[PDB]
Symmetry: C3
């Protein structure tokens, strides 16, 4: 894809909700159709049919698949064979090997565990990689913690550490850098603060979970 | 050991003070009997006899030995042969090789130098490792600095950087993560702040230097 | 050189301004004569003649050359052959290989790109390296960003992350650690804050762009 030519506003859309695909695509620069956490276990088969029967522009759509080694991932790759999509987002990306095994597709590696952070440069360097993203929620969960943000709302240090790690790793290997979702959708002040910072430090994209976030991201990345 | 089954409150006890061993063990989840800085050069021989003649429960006790390559470390390992202890804490841990050479014992690697930080993942991955700890005092000392904390009491950036480095490295390799000692014992406010943060980001343990710290650690790690 | 014996106040002096070399050397502990950004494309040939015809004490002077693989770097190394200088500062240092290729000279590697940060330990370990420096301006520029500092004047997280990375990498390999320039020359409050922090965490040097900065650096590093 020409991912860098598309704007900074990427938007997750659960793949079991095809009646929303068209609105997502007109609201966003790029849509991430999601087969992992946006979709309940029981509705994943249905998401996979929707992925095949309701297409979006493949130059502006990526698919978030399930994690390395899972049965769900194998079922997802089977469903993708029926589409025109070329670019997948790998959750819980923990090794170069997990990226390589997705060739010949392009991969955005979403690093949200300790192992992924420690191996960030190896992941970024892997031949299929075209982008690196980070997520604070599952990072804190898999570390054994309870809260990604302190009381005043700033990320805790380890999240801030991983953020920089992934920005550097992506940029060292010429990859797109994607900043993490702002989970408090109505907190537009917080999102503006993060997206302006993201833009200023050289993130390419801030990923969004609701269409209302897109304008604020696009404005933050203006100059 | 089943270190994860024991609580979050670990407590250093100088090994030259056997009259205190029993009180330490009833106050703490785990006791670290110390052969390094808690004991003066001249009293180390005596600590080593105390280590042999006054035993603690080996399921709930670890021994802090001296650093790699030192004569003191060799004398410590000789004294440990006479005990039931299985798990040692290696100060100034700087390489996988320093951990490997302690096999077949289990090792908590205490990283408190630049080299240890740079090599954190290699240290964490080493087969004997069961835990990773960090210490800010000797990190700053060996870097050539003078102060681990700024005027408002927060750690300086490099300490905060090492903290996250060791949390990630431990968690990437399935190891226990131990947060650094709060040296200002009477500053219970500061300890509560650090331990609640430690718990929230997935530290398993906060290490203590005085029995009064244990309750505050155990409460911070509650939920 | 005996770089550690010289003071903490290093000062850049554009190499096209030889009428200023003597004043720079009396104002500073060490002078960095600059062939890269302090000198415009058209004046570089002239800088190189000045470097040869107006000598400074080689025990107290280093030369900032141009980047790896550039024609300018090759012209710089040709000009240096005519001098008594032994120690060069490599901008945009990105690999051990870029340092090795400068042997047998001593090298201060100035890390100011993502690749340099990711490869910091490899760079520090390289045999010619005697020092590591970082720069926030070109780090942010090459990452694709616009601002190294937030509104309240603190560095953005990625700069703070690289700072610590380079301090650790230098110290892990016994190298001098050089803290980044304070670009707002008249902001002596900001420089004092950074230099006192630098000194406290074990930086050896804070690099300066104007002679007025030297006293404030030397006082910050006192004890």
């Amino acid at each position: 894809m020409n991912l860098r030519a598309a704007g900074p506003g990427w938007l997750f859309c659960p793949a079991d909700a095809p009646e929303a695909f068209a609105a997502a695509a007109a609201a966003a620069d790029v849509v991430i159709l999601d087969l992992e956490d946006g979709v309940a276990a029981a509705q994943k088969p249905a998401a996979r049919n929707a992925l095949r029967d309701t297409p979006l522009d493949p130059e502006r759509t990526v698919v978030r698949i399930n994690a390395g080694g899972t049965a769900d991932q194998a079922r997802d790759l089977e469903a993708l064979a029926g589409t025109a999509y070329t670019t997948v987002m790998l959750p819980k990306a923990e090794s170069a090997a997990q990226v390589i095994e997705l060739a010949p597709r392009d991969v955005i590696a979403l690093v949200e565990t300790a192992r992924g952070a420690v191996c960030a440069a190896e992941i970024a360097a892997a031949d299929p990689t075209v982008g690196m993203m980070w997520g604070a929620e599952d990072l804190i969960a898999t570390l054994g913690g309870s809260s990604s943000r302190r009381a005043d709302g700033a990320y805790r240090d380890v999240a801030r550490h991983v953020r920089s790690t992934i920005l550097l790793a992506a940029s060292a290997f010429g990859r797109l850098a994607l900043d993490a979702v702002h989970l408090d959708i109505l907190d537009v002040e917080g999102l503006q603060e993060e997206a302006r910072d993201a833009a200023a430090v050289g993130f390419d994209v801030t990923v969004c979970i609701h269409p209302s976030q897109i304008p604020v991201v696009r404005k933050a990345y203006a100059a």
